[PDB]
Amino acid sequence: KMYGPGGGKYFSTTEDYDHEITGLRVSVGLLLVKSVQVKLGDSWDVKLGALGGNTQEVTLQPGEYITKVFVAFQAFLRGMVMYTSKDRYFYFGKLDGQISSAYPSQEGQVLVGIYGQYQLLGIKSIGFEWNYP
After folding, report:
1. Counting beta carbons within 10 angstroms of the beta carbon of residue 51, is it exposed (0 to 12), middle (13 to 18) or buried (19 or more)?
2. What is d(CA 51, CA 64) in angstroms, rounded to the nearest whole number?
3. 8-state DSSP, 43
4. Strand-pair partners of 111
5. Which DSSP string corresponds to 51-119?
6. Cα(first)–Cα(last) distance of the chain, in Å?
7. Is 11 helix (H, G, I), strand (E, B) or coil?
8. Burial environment of residue 85 by CB neighbours within 10 A (0 to 12, 13 to 18, 19 or more)
9. List of domains in the chain
């Protein structure tokens, strides 16, 4: 469920039937992952987290799901790696701090949301919602 030292303002991505995560954007400053943003179908969901940084955009091909995520913390979320069902990885930031593994406890489940806590400087805490397409 919830990774990091935490404390902050709670966020969670919009979770929808009829619409899945088709893409994603993570904002990274010089060091910290500031904010995340999922595209749900043909529309970017609200952008959640600290302001600022450079935003990496990543686009899932149809039928491609996020199935696992590594996350590194250091007072603030430094880095995140997402692996998909098409043998594709997406690196954001640098994996340095305390690495942690998020995966579904069940088979064929895939990333449906992201949630956590953030403050002014970036994200203090992150977690992932798994579920069938």
Report:
1. exposed
2. 29
3. S
4. 130
5. --SEEEEEEPPTT--EEEEEEEESSSEEEEEEEETTS-EEEEE---SEEEEE--SSTT-EEEEEEEEEE
6. 19
7. strand
8. middle
9. 1-133 (2.100.10.30)
